[PDB]
Write a protein that binds this ligand. Structure first.
Ligand code: HEM
Length: 400
């Protein structure tokens, strides 16, 4: 029978072993989801791009056959959708309401603020020190960098960043009880509702204010929509950002020649980030669709109302596109084809430019501030996310 999906990673920092075998022998195949239903799994870069862009395929989760991967996903599909789950024309109608903050030009203008945020958190880490033992690079740095930035862009005042960063981490931490995670989730929603009310009365220079002035007050959306769009911008990317920073540090520890290159030349940070986002595809389960009508993909017929999962993680190890795909090599010559860490097509990550700027700032600065930063536990003992989840690192003891 069809194998259960998601697959488990072969080891902490490695993709599922199944993908390489499927790319070679069965690139479009059926898998079994948690509820016994079937879906198609696409593994080759060319086919992943096809799934991401076909207008015969839908992200609408109330359609029959949509591939929810967990009971929690089926429950969430009942809520009013935001743009992540919309097809044209609704998709860009709502996405355009927030895209201006994320353009290449806007993100370029944010660089001094990004640098300041990274610098301030690194100085706090230096002041705290590691004189009594290792400290957790996740809690002290990888978590607050993306958290403080997206909260600040949404509209949160500086004084509230540390508490709300903690609450949002509790929301997804593997140690939280269900009650703890749900209380934190509701706390964030309650806070954002009050902030939306505040910015309806007195807008400021932030995303929530622009939504209030330009969309809520004219009746294009309502205030509960503004809350859910802000919430989506917070939760869609934050845990992924945290994992990418931590995975970057662990990857450099595993590749000491390339770490020495980067220590000697911080201008290598953009190339490091490009290879990191290809090699550790920390969001691998988001390119999902159902077929609105029959669609042929390779040697398979995907029938109407059947579900499809396109693995950008597998695409990013596709030997036909990326030579020596399973070697981490930030000095590689890149091919014409895009790496797919941020997806592809209309739904390609709204924050791709922001995310790359955050990661570039981190990795051009971290080792200038801390030239002797070391992972404090044996690399084989790093606490990765459980193997049946997206790749990530839960905590990362360091000294410096
Ligand atoms: C390195 C960090 C990140 C990675 C690897 C990443 C990856 C992804 C991927 C794979 C998708 C799916 C794209 C598709 O459907 O083809 C996506 C979508 C999305 N991401 Fe991220 N992301 C990152 C950071 C962020 C951040 C920081 C934010 C918010 C500030 C964010 C917000 C979103 C949203 C809202 C979508 C849905 C876009 C749409 O469907 O129109 N992401 N991201």
């Amino acid at each position: 029978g069809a194998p259960s999906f998601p697959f488990s990673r072969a080891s902490g920092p490695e993709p599922p072993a199944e993908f390489a075998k499927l790319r070679a022998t069965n690139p479009v195949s059926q898998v079994k989801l948690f509820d016994g239903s079937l879906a198609w799994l696409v593994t080759k870069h060319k086919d992943v791009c096809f799934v991401a862009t076909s207008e015969k395929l839908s992200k609408v989760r109330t359609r029959q056959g949509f591939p929810e991967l967990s009971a929690s996903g089926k429950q969430a599909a009942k809520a009013k959708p935001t743009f992540v789950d919309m097809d044209p024309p609704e998709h860009m109608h709502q996405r355009s309401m927030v895209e201006p903050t994320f353009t290449p030009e806007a993100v370029k203008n944010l660089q001094p603020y990004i640098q300041r945020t990274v610098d301030d958190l690194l100085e706090q880490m230096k002041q705290k020190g590691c004189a009594n033992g290792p400290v957790d690079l996740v809690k002290e740095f990888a978590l607050p960098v993306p958290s403080y930035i997206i909260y600040t862009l949404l509209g949160v005042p500086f004084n509230d960043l540390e508490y709300l960063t903690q609450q949002n981490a509790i929301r997804t931490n593997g140690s939280s009880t269900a009650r703890e995670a749900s209380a934190a989730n509701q706390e964030l929603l309650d806070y954002l509702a009050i902030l939306v009310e505040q910015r309806l009365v007195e807008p400021k220079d932030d995303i929530i204010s622009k939504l209030c002035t330009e969309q809520v007050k004219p009746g294009n959306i309502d205030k509960s929509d503004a809350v859910q769009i802000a919430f989506l911008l917070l939760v869609a990317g934050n845990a992924t950002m945290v994992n990418m920073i931590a995975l970057g540090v662990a990857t450099l520890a595993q590749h000491p020649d390339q770490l020495a290159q980067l220590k000697a030349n911080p201008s290598l940070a953009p190339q490091f980030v490009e290879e990191l986002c290809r090699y550790h595809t920390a969001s691998a389960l988001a390119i999902k669709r159902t077929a609105k009508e029959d669609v042929m993909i390779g040697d398979k017929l995907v029938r109407a109302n059947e579900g499809i999962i396109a693995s950008n993680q597998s695409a990013n190890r596709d030997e036909e596109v990326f030579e020596n795909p399973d070697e981490f090599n930030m000095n590689r010559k890149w091919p014409p084809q895009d790496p797919l860490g941020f997806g592809f097509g209309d739904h390609r990550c709204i924050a791709e430019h922001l995310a790359k700027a955050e990661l570039t700032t981190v990795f051009s600065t971290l080792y200038q501030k801390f030239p002797d930063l070391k992972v404090a536990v044996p690399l084989g003992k790093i606490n990765y996310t459980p193997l049946n989840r997206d790749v990530g690192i839960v905590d990362l003891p360091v000294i410096f």
